[PDB]
Amino acid sequence: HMKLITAIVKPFTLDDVKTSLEDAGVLGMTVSEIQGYGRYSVDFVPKVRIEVVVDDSIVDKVVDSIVRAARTGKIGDGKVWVSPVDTIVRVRTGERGHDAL
Amino acid sequence: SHMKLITAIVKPFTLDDVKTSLEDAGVLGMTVSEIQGYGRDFVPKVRIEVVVDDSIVDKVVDSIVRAARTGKIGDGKVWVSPVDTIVRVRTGERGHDAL
Amino acid sequence: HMKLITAIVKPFTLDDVKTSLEDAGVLGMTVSEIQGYGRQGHTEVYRGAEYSVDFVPKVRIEVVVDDSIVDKVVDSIVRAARTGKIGDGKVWVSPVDTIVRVRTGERGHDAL
Ligand SMILES: Nc1ncnc2c1ncn2[C@@H]1O[C@H](COP(=O)(O)OP(=O)(O)OP(=O)(O)O)[C@@H](O)[C@H]1O
Ligand SMILES: Nc1ncnc2c1ncn2[C@@H]1O[C@H](COP(=O)(O)OP(=O)(O)OP(=O)(O)O)[C@@H](O)[C@H]1O
Ligand SMILES: Nc1ncnc2c1ncn2[C@@H]1O[C@H](COP(=O)(O)OP(=O)(O)OP(=O)(O)O)[C@@H](O)[C@H]1O
Domains along chain C? Answer: 1-112 (3.30.70.120)
The data reach a resolution, in angstroms, of 2.4
Rounded CA-CA distance B1/B80 in Å is 14
Is the separation of the CB atoms in C99 and B4 below 8 Å? no
Q: Is A73 exposed, middle or buried (0-12, 13-18, 19+ CB in 10 A)?
A: exposed
Contacts of A34 in chain B (CB under 8 A): 31-33
Rounded CA-CA distance B20/B38 in Å is 27
Is the separation of the CB atoms in C31 and C10 below 8 Å? no
In the chain, the amino acid numbered B5 is L
Rounded CA-CA distance A13/B86 in Å is 19
Proportion of chain B in helix, strand, coil states, percent, rounded to 5: 30, 40, 25
After which residues, if any, is chain C broken (C to N > 2.5 Å)?
40
Q: Which of C5, C6, C29, C104 to mutate to test the pocket of ligand 2 (most atoms within 8 A of CB)?
A: C29
Q: Which atom of ligand 3 is nearest to the CA of C34?
A: 31
B4, B42, B70 ranked by CB distance to C97: nearest: B4
What 8-state DSSP symbol labels residue C54? S
Rounded CA-CA distance A81/A85 in Å is 13
Q: How far is the CA of B39 from the centre of ligand 2 (A)?
A: 5
Helix (H, G, I), strand (E, B) or coil at C97: coil
Rounded CA-CA distance A67/A55 in Å is 18
Helix (H, G, I), strand (E, B) or coil at C83: coil
Rounded CA-CA distance A85/C94 in Å is 5
